[PDB]
């Protein structure tokens, strides 16, 4: 009764996804400023850094790396569409079709202090992705072949609740990612709460429904220590979710 990954790779049309959430011009551009909030705490002023973040199911967008891209040497984006990597990779190479996150990233300029403009930031952000690969969380090895050094951090953003259909498979997913991560590394997780589905226009896509408790146990359970944890209220619209808020949390790999 869930949403089979193969939908993925040909019913989520990542443009329409970007213009549904991301044009930033509403209960989305409210969500994606806390998110970006939270990501400049995590990434710039505690002391998330080093040298490989990987980011999982990072779909077409970019929002999550602007600022990791100030504390990461490089940084891999992954995702299991390839269209969504297509999109991004649009993005990576400046071409006039590329979503406009212009916006987006003036609004990551002014939290950071408005030390750089637009500009140099996208140009640093440009310079940090290096690899931009095919993943899938449910398998032991989500990157399949491809090996990558153990990295220092691993951020994904509304991705596990889209990618697991039942609660063991995300304690599994929890797991299979940390097999990324260093001893000690980082796992940055931010994603809705209590959402059995999302819509991308008429295009019905499941997520997993768990509240708070759930995804604390399963991380708990796949091996990790919790540092700090938010829950915030605000859900999406609802023409596009029935979320109860959304969570992110950062842990440290045992
Ligand atoms: N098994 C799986 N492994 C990895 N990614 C998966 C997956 N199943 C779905 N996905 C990806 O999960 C993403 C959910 S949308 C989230 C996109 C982006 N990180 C953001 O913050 O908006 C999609 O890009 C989808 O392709
Ligand atoms: C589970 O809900 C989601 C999953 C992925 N992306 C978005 C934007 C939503 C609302």
Same mark, same amino acid.
């Given at each position: 009764?869930?949403?089979?990954? !193969? ?8 443009? +329409? ?7 930033? /011009? ?6 994606? &400023? ?6 400049? &705490? @995590? ?7 080093? +040298?490989?973040? @990987? +980011?999982? /199911? ?35 190479? #400046?071409?006039?079709?590329?979503? !406009? ?34 993943? !899938? ?23 596990? +609740?889209?990618?697991?259909? !039942? ?5 599994? #997913? ?9 001893? /000690?590394?980082?796992?940055? *997780? ?9 819509? *991308? ?30 829950? *915030? ?22």
């Amino acid at each position: 009764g869930f949403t089979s990954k !193969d939908t993925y790779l040909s019913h989520f049309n990542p443009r +329409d996804y970007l213009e549904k959430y991301y044009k930033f /011009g509403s209960a989305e551009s409210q969500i994606l &400023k806390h998110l970006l909030k939270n990501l400049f &705490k @995590i990434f710039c002023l505690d002391g998330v850094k080093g +040298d490989l973040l @990987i +980011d999982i /199911g990072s779909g077409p967008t970019i929002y999550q790396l602007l600022s990791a891209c100030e504390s990461f040497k490089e940084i891999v984006v992954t995702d299991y569409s390839d269209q969504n990597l297509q999109e991004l990779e649009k993005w990576l190479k #400046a071409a006039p079709a590329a979503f !406009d996150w212009s916006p987006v990233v003036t609004y990551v300029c002014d939290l950071e202090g408005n030390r750089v403009k637009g500009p140099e930031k996208e140009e640093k952000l440009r310079q940090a992705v290096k690899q931009v690969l095919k993943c !899938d969380v449910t398998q032991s090895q989500p990157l399949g072949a491809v090996p990558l050094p153990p990295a220092d951090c691993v951020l994904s953003t509304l991705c596990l +609740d889209a990618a697991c259909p !039942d609660l063991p498979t995300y304690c599994r #997913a929890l797991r299979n990612l940390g097999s990324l991560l260093k001893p /000690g590394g980082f796992l940055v *997780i931010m994603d809705a709460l209590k959402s059995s589905y999302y819509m *991308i226009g008429e295009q019905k896509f499941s997520s997993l429904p768990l509240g708070r408790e759930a995804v604390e146990a399963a991380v708990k359970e796949a091996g990790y220590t919790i540092e700090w944890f938010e829950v *915030i209220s605000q859900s999406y619209s609802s023409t596009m979710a029935n979320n109860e808020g959304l969570f992110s949390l950062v842990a440290r790999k045992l």
